[PDB]
């Protein structure tokens, strides 16, 4: 069934790749933000996660929706796990020059997210009206993990997220996570765990881990074979399968935005499930581009099985269950399950329409 899947993959490639003014209007906004935050007391160490990363699209169908992360280095951090949750933490400080820059947001020993996300929101909203180039509107609708959302002109839309960076070892709830040893090798997993980790706020004053940088690195070096996709002798469909899980869910989320049943689902749940299938199917031969449709079916199948059983291990923190009934109720997962099965049986109609 590769014919129709390819056609949808091509439609989407041609709008990512198409000449767009958006990325420019974004870069100039973030560049001004950075220098205005950098000469400030609390944010002098702010930076962009990457460079050349003004164009990260979480919404694979919506190309005018951008996502930027600003990172801040926190040296000698004290992490405390909240309520045995495995994945949510308080931040505190070892205090060497016990007047570290962030000291103005403390609460006894515990670092306050919501205060930071206000001096941050206010410092940005300050230099936003100072902007004379183009139009910039920020809305502070609740849910501050897409913390600050800027709107540039009418179409294009930017989500600014602020993250803490630590260069120490990943927290101990990740110790058994990232089980890539039989796929990407034990020595790549060590290499990856030598990288820094990042914290963002939850919605209490708790923080969660952000592994987008590691996803990115897996996705750009994703084969059991070192030369995967450096050719078309050996071009695989891993990335394409991920794109079709993402597009499947954005389309279902959009088609059913009126009713509320899909609101807790995000691309994070799709990425997670996908990598678990990469771990189950570690050989490049199990991802032949000839077999796009079969491999996609595996992904859809596996995800649906997570829903019905209410189990989807975080890829990095094996004890944390993304589909726990306390995180997402049975009603919802049972709803997503039915909707997807209706797609799968009908050769996914949600695709030929845009
Ligand atoms: C959008 N959203 C994320 C969380 C969340 C919650 C708890 C938690 F521990 C984590 C850890 N992050 C990942 O597992 C992760 C996996 C991949 Br693949 C890529 C990036 C990632 O950050 C995330 C909640 N909403
Ligand atoms: Zn490949």
Swiss-Prot record:
Q: What is the effect of changing residue 92 to E?
A: Does not affect interaction with nucleosomes
Please list the residues that carry the modification PolyADP-ribosyl aspartic acid: 31
What's the impact of mutating residue 11 to A? No effect on stimulation of interferon production
Q: Which organism is it from?
A: Homo sapiens
- List Phosphotyrosine occurrences by residue: 55
Q: Keyword Lyase, does the record have it?
A: no
Q: What is the effect of changing residue 94 to E?
A: Abolishes stimulation of interferon production. Abolished interaction with nucleosomes
**What cofactors does the UniProt entry give for this protein?**
Mg(2+); Mn(2+); Zn(2+)
The chain residues annotated with the modification N6-methyllysine are 338
Positions carrying (Microbial infection) Deamidated glutamine are 283, 286
User: Under which name does UniProt file this protein?
Assistant: Cyclic GMP-AMP synthase
């Amino acid at each position: 069934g590769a014919s129709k899947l390819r056609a949808v993959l091509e439609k989407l490639k041609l709008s990512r790749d198409d000449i767009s003014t958006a990325a420019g209007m974004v870069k100039g906004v973030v560049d001004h933000l950075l220098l205005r935050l950098k000469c400030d007391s609390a944010f002098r160490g702010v930076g962009l996660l990457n460079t050349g990363s003004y164009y990260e699209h979480v919404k694979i169908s919506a190309p005018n929706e951008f996502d930027v992360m600003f990172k801040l280095e926190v040296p000698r951090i004290q992490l405390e796990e909240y309520s045995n949750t495995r994945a949510y933490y308080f931040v505190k400080f070892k205090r060497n020059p016990k007047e570290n820059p962030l000291s103005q947001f403390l609460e006894g020993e515990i670092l306050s997210a919501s205060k930071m996300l206000s001096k941050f929101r206010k410092i940005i909203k300050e230099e936003i009206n100072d902007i004379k180039d183009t139009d910039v509107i920020m809305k502070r609708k609740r849910g501050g993990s897409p913390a600050v959302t800027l709107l540039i002109s009418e179409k294009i839309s930017v989500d600014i997220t602020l993250a803490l960076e630590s260069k120490s070892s990943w927290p101990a709830s990740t110790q058994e996570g990232l089980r890539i040893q039989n796929w990407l090798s034990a020595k790549v997993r060590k290499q990856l765990r030598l990288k820094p980790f990042y914290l963002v706020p939850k919605h209490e004053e708790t923080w969660r881990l952000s592994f987008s940088h590691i996803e990115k690195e897996i996705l750009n070096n994703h084969g059991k074979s070192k030369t995967c996709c450096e050719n078309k002798e050996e071009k695989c469909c891993r990335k394409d399968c991920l794109k079709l899980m993402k597009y499947l869910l954005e389309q279902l989320k959009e088609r059913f935005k009126d009713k509320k049943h899909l609101d807790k689902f995000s691309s994070y749940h799709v990425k997670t499930a996908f990598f678990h299938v990469c771990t189950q199917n570690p050989q490049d031969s199990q991802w032949d581009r000839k077999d796009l449709g079969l491999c996609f079916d595996n992904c859809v199948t596996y995800f649906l099985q997570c829903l019905r059983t209410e189990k989807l291990e975080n890829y990095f923190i094996p004890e944390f269950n993304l589909f726990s009934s306390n995180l997402i109720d049975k009603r919802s997962k049972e709803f997503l399950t039915k909707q997807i099965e209706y797609e799968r049986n009908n050769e996914f109609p949600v695709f030929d329409e845009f």
